[PDB]
Amino acid sequence: IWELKKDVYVVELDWYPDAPGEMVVLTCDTPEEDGITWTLDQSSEVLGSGKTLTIQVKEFGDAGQYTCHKGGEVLSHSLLLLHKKEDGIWSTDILKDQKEPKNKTFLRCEAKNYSGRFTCWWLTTISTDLTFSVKSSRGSSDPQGVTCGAATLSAERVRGDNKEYEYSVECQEDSACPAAEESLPIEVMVDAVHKLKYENYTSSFFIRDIIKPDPPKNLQLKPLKSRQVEVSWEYPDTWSTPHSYFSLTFCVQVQGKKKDRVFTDKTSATVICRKNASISVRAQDRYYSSSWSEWASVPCS
Amino acid sequence: SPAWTQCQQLSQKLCTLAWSAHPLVTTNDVPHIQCGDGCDPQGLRDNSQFCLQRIHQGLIFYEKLLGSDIFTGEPSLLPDSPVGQLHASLLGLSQLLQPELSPSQPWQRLLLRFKILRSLQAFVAVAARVFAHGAATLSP
Numbered sequence A: 001i002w003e004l005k006k007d008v009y010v011v012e013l014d015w016y017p018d019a020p021g022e023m024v025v026l027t028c029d030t031p032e033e034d035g036i037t038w039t040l041d042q043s044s045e046v047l048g049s050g051k052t053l054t055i056q057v058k059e060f061g062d063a064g065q066y067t068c069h070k071g072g073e074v075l076s077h078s079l080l081l082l083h084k085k086e087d088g089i090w091s092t093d094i095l096k097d098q099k100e101p102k103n104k105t106f107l108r109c110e111a112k113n114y115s116g117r118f119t120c121w122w123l124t125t126i127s128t129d130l131t132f133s134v135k136s137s138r139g140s141s142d143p144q145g146v147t148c149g150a151a152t153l154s155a156e157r158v159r160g161d162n163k164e165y166e167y168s169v170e171c172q173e174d175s176a177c178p179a180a181e182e183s184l185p186i187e188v189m190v191d192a193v194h195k196l197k198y199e200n201y202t203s204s205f206f207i208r209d210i211i212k213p214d215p216p217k218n219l220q221l222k223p224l225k226s227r228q229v230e231v232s233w234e235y236p237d238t239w240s241t242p243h244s245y246f247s248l249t250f251c252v253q254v255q256g257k258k259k260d261r262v263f264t265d266k267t268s269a270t271v272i273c274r275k276n277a278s279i280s281v282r283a284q285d286r287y288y289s290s291s292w293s294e295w296a297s298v299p300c301s
Numbered sequence B: 001s002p003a004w005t006q007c008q009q010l011s012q013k014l015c016t017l018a019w020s021a022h023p024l025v026t027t028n029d030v031p032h033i034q035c036g037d038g039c040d041p042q043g044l045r046d047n048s049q050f051c052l053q054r055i056h057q058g059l060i061f062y063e064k065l066l067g068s069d070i071f072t073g074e075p076s077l078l079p080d081s082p083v084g085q086l087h088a089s090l091l092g093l094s095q096l097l098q099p100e101l102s103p104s105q106p107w108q109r110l111l112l113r114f115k116i117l118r119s120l121q122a123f124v125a126v127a128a129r130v131f132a133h134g135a136a137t138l139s140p
C-alpha cells in the first residue's frame, strides 16, 4: 500500500480468482483511544474496533472510503483505491489505446516549436466519476522542472449511446533551451481514477521528436503571362526564431480532381498552374525529420 | 574565417546520410551540444569559436566511435550501411574546423549502433543550424 494523496491510498493487486490479496492496516487519525469502530462507505455494519483495522484487500468490495467513529462522532477517513495488475500488466481500462504510432499509445504529445511548450491528448469512454492528474519533468535521476496545467475536455463524439471523450493538457519547461541538443527526455505522467480504480500512464519523448510546425502563413500567387505562377508564403508565426537558425523546408503541391511536387528551402517557387487546381504548401524542420505541418492551400487561377 | 558554406554543405550531407541508416532489421554515453556550449544564435554572435570548438570535440568523438569495435566488429555491417560514408563526412567536417561500451552479445551491439546513429541525427541537426546561421550572419 502507498499514499497517493492525503487520506487516499493505492493497493496493488495481482488480479486473478482465489488470489490472497494484501493485508492492509488502517489507522484512525484521532487523539481518542477507546470506543472506536470502523465502517465502509454507506454501510452501518461495524467492521472492527480499536484505533486500527486490519483487512484482507482482495476485490473492490474491500476498497472504498473507510470511516472510523467514536459513536456518533465521525473521526477520520481512509480512501482505498486498487491498481489491478492483470496477466502481469497494469490495467489500461480508463484510457483508449490510440494505436498510433505503435500499440499501447495512450498519451500523444505535440509541440509547435522548440520553446518548451507542448500539449498532450488522450481518449476515454468514461463520462462520470473520472479524475485526471498531470505531472511532468525532464529526466528522472535529477528531474528538471516542467509546469503543467489541468487536464480539460477538448472534444466529444457521440453516436447514439456510445460517447467518446478527448482530454488535453498544456505543459511548459521551466528553463527551456530551444537550441540545445536534448540529452534527457521529457516525462509526462497521468494519474487516472475512476470510482475505486487507479491507473497511471507515462509518455517519454524529446521535444524535437514531437515537433509539428503550423502551416505556412500568407500563401499567395503572382501570375506571369507559359501561364506560370510565382508562389510565395511565410514561416508560421509560432515557429521558433530566428529563421536563419531554426530553418524550415517546404513541399509545394499542385493537385486537381496527377500531381506536381517541388521541394524547396526557399519561401517562393514557380509552378505551372492549371484550371480548377490548387496550390498547397506544407512545412517541416529542415535539419531533423519530424512531422510535416498541415497543408495550406489557395485556389488556382 | 570559419568557411561557413562548406560546413553547411557537409553538415547537410550528414543529416541526409544519418537518416538513411536502418541497422535494426536512450543513449547514455555520447556527447551533446548542450545549453552551456553556446551554440544558440546569440551565443554564436558573441563567441563563435567557443561553440565550434565543442562541435569539433563531438565530431571527433563520433568519428572515433564509428571507427571502432562497436561498428567494425561482429555482427558485420551490411554493404549498404552508411557508417563508412558518415565516417568520411564527419572526418571532413572536423578538418574544416581545425586541421591539427563494447557489449558482449551481438544483439546488444546492433542496438548500441542504433542508439549511436539516432544520437548523431540530433547532434548534426544542431550543427547544421549553427553553420546555416553563421553563413547568414557571421560571413563577410
Ligand SMILES: *[C@@H]1O[C@H](CO)[C@@H](O[C@@H]2O[C@H](CO)[C@@H](O[C@@H]3O[C@H](CO)[C@@H](O)[C@H](O[C@H]4O[C@H](CO)[C@@H](O)[C@H](O)[C@@H]4O)[C@@H]3O)[C@H](O)[C@H]2NC(C)=O)[C@H](O)[C@H]1NC(C)=O
Binding pocket: A001, A002, A003, A004, A010, A012, A083, A189, A200
Ligand atoms: C504508477 O503506478 C505504480 C504502480 O502502482 C507506482 O509505483 C509505486 O509507487 C509507490 C510510491 O512511490 C511505491 O511505494 C513505495 O514502496 C516502497 C517499498 O517498495 C516503500 O518503501 C515506500 O514507502 C515510503 O512511502 C510510503 C507512502 O507511499 C510511506 O508510508 C513510507 O513511510 C515511505 O515514506 C513507498 O510505499 C510502490 O512500491 C510502487 N510500486 C511499484 C510496483 O513500483 C507509481 O509510483 C505510479 N506513478 C506515479 C507517478 O504515481
